[PDB]
């Protein structure tokens, strides 16, 4: 009967409208569960096709070919196009894919330089990107996601695979697993690929002597995949020596995502800076692997949106005992310390990073420090 | 010579001019080293002060008590007032301390969803803001964090205190360490912790016979400290159970932090809503301690600021070869799956929740998705 009682229940009832709510509009999901479609029309202002070229033509698959799908509107019969369908369509009307423009596989080193698995969703969600972009369906392209960034809180192995030595068709039906999206294919880590990654050196030894420590994941893994995927993106990084040499000895391409706060950004540059010292000794003990690019990014955990939605839910549930006052982001500008010190701490002349990110943030700070005074007082007195 | 050598090497100059900067700028720190004042008029805007009523008052306190700071401008002096400065102006002028209306330690519990020691960082920049703060300086506030959460890459011993039993003096003058910030004082935690949380059952039978093991928080270290502080924040979460359970059994009030992301929230809220059940079996097992309320707040993790002089840097290093696409959030919508769920496989039918949110980081992770297409062919080709 209490507040902190009460606020739990609403909060209990909140869940329980989410969970059924995700009942209701799912078994309608399982009634197909694996993706999304275009309309007709649509294909038009899509690349190569044009309204005709394309309506006028699917007629004609349609009776000397296979199939599609439909629902009508009343009068009106609706189309659903599957990315099959539009990669099929380019393919009837002769436009080229990827796969024809270039042979091997083209591989992507996305690093992780956060210590956390939460890297591998984005990657696969990258891949995802890539593949059904409306204006890159005309390149029929496999990606294959290469996991070899295990985790803990966060978090068939990549791993494995690379210390024995399945040839391609092993690969393919006992380590690659499909994911949502048809055209990606992924290679799986676990929790105890960090062993593996741990002991890499008397591992190597045993399980496959005479090999380059390096290579392992290039020749035992890539070599024999490159001819099945137009794009390999490998995901892996510093905390993981070796699967980080590893991927750099098998990347032809590598991108850097920099996080949007001045420590973890420090420690970014760190890592651009040592690259070329790692990539050495790389050529040094073996293959003279050429990685030539370090294409940079932004890194970006907002999304406004959610921000907003998650509020009002907040709100929803702990009403009026939810301060109108945010706590601002605390700890990416002058490491805690030896001492402790707080953004409250750094004097704006002593600071070397954005004077502005640091007034903002104390103010902030301070807002919220007054707004917990407060609700406590009235709480004390009244 | 390489594109990635040249661009680590300019990384590698970006870090050295942060380096000598941070230099330059703290020699005249160690001068001091310790804080930040206020000028002479700038008391008036303060609250119970006055330009006079303080003005001509510190002249009486000047000459018949003690000191204060200055540095000149030509043919005007000004002065240099610290936190104590004015925390002892409030007292010459009478205005009574917090001390004054409440006699014991009022304790606050912050719980820390998140399993990062990164909310250490927060609390203390809590206690920092509610003792610098411009109308609570009248106050002259002694708040104590008790870091009771242990982590591993974000990271006299509380857990210690706890099993042992220093009194008072004791634990003033072997745990408790002072901040940067006069008022606050920690009382540190190590990954050492973890073990004793792990093993609490048994460490306490041991160590400390008959107690309840959940008093021991209260008991053995705050009942000894609550006269000689006004606010006692405990810092720990649901993962450290025990605990966690102490915390609880020692908080008058609890403030929950809300992520600002769709599956951090739900979580959450699942913590809201078993706090009754906790709180509950922590008096059935013995001391019926009152945990009344559980107020709510919004955490952020962003600063605009920071993104941008971030930003600029990255510019500054990676010139042309920094995708001028930022990747979007991707990892708090849908989990990711058994398959794998990214935002690009979600029905905007089958999500319950914010749709917004969701279509902005499909969109953004499309963009993100063709930019890097795109360097890759332009890399390719040429």
């Not at 953004?343 to 070397?352: D, M």
Request: proline letters at 4%; a negative charge.
């Amino acid at each position: 009967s209490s507040q902190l009682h009460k606020v739990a229940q609403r909060a209990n009832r909140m869940l329980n409208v989410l969970t059924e709510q995700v009942q209701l509009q799912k078994d309608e999901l399982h009634a197909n569960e694996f993706y999304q479609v275009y309309a007709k029309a649509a294909l038009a202002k899509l690349p190569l096709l044009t309204r005709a070229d394309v309506d006028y033509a699917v007629s004609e698959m349609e009776e000397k070919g296979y199939v599609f799908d439909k629902r009508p509107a009343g009068s009106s019969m609706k189309y659903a196009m599957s990315i099959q369908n539009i990669i099929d369509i380019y393919e009837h009307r002769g436009t080229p894919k990827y796969r024809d423009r270039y042979s091997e596989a083209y591989v992507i080193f996305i690093s992780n330089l956060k210590g956390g698995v939460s890297q591998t969703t984005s990657t696969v969600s990258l891949a995802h990107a890539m593949r059904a972009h409306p204006h890159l369906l005309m390149e029929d392209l496999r990606i294959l996601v290469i996991d070899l960034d295990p985790q803990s809180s966060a978090t068939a192995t990549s791993a494995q695979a690379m210390l024995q030595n399945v040839s391609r068709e092993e690969l393919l039906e006992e380590f690659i697993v499909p994911s949502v999206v048809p055209g990606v294919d992924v290679m799986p880590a676990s929790i105890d690929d960090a062993f593996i990654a741990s002991d890499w050196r008397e591992l190597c030894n045993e399980h496959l002597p005479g090999q380059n420590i390096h290579a392992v994941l290039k020749e035992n893994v890539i070599d024999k995949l490159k001819s099945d995927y137009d794009f390999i993106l490998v995901d892996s990084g510093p905390h993981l020596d070796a699967f980080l040499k590893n991927a750099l000895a098998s990347a032809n391409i590598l991108f850097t995502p920099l996080p949007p706060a001045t420590v973890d950004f420090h420690s970014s540059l760190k890592y651009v800076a040592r690259l070329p010292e790692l990539v050495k000794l790389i050529s040094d003990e073996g293959c003279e692997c050429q990685l030539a690019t370090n294409i940079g990014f932004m890194s970006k955990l907002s999304n406004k949106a959610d921000h907003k939605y998650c509020h009002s839910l907040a709100k929803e549930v702990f009403g009026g005992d939810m301060l109108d006052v945010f706590l601002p982001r605390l700890d990416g500008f002058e490491r805690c310390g030896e001492s402790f010190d707080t953004v409250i701490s750094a004097n704006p002349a002593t600071y070397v990073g954005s004077a502005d990110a640091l007034k903002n943030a104390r103010i902030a700070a301070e807002d919220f420090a007054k707004a917990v005074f407060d609700r406590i007082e009235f709480i004390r007195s009244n």
